[PDB]
Design a protein around this ligand. Structure first.
Ligand SMILES: Nc1nc2c([nH]c(=O)n2[C@H]2C[C@H](O)[C@@H](COP(=O)(O)O)O2)c(=O)[nH]1
Ligand SMILES: OC[C@H]1O[C@@](CO)(O[C@H]2O[C@H](CO)[C@@H](O)[C@H](O)[C@H]2O)[C@@H](O)[C@@H]1O
Ligand SMILES: [Mn+2]
Ligand code: NA
Length: 129
């Protein structure tokens, strides 16, 4: 079974809102809300991966970020390890740089059902902040 290491950024502004994108209709976890992120490539670290992925997907460079959660999830056809980085400082303004929907969402209003099931404990822990 496919095994993947995924790095994602929880992009939180000063108003307790998170920058959330929506996955394509033909992707794994299609139409789900998501933290921007992607696969950690050979020869790059989890910290380098979250920087690169956020630069590619939403056009910001995260800085002074921290590991919020690391967890593993077994999907029906793949196993992934998710590295959830809390990003509270960055250069740039996040946008749909890859043409994907993106918008700021209040932390209190997040609905874990809208995200891949792997995100359930992370969304709960975020609302604990
Ligand atoms: N980018 C991103 N991927 C996620 C999240 N939660 C989650 O289970 N995934 C899974 C979906 C995909 O199988 C994989 C991400 O790979 P791509 O972003 O390259 O599609 O990780 C998330 O919050 N953000
Ligand atoms: O692993 C993140 C963790 O490390 C600290 C230092 O203790 O931050 C360092 O690592 C981050 C990821 O590369 C950098 O963004 C940061 O600048 C660097 O100091 C903690 O702040 C953080 O919890
Ligand atoms: Mn991605
Ligand atoms: Na990507």
């Amino acid at each position: 079974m496919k095994k993947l290491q995924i790095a994602v950024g929880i992009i939180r502004n000063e108003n307790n809102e998170i920058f959330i994108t929506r996955r394509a209709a033909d992707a794994h976890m299609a139409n789900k809300l998501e933290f921007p992120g992607g696969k950690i490539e050979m020869g790059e670290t989890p910290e380098q991966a979250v920087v690169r992925e956020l630069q590619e997907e939403v056009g910001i460079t995260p800085q002074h970020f921290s590991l919020f959660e690391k967890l593993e999830y077994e999907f029906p056809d793949r196993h992934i390890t998710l590295w959830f980085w809390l990003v509270e400082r960055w250069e740039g303004e996040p946008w749909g740089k890859e043409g994907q929907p993106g918008e700021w969402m209040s932390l209190v209003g997040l609905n874990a059902d809208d995200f891949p099931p792997a995100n359930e404990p992370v969304i709960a822990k975020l609302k604990r902040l």
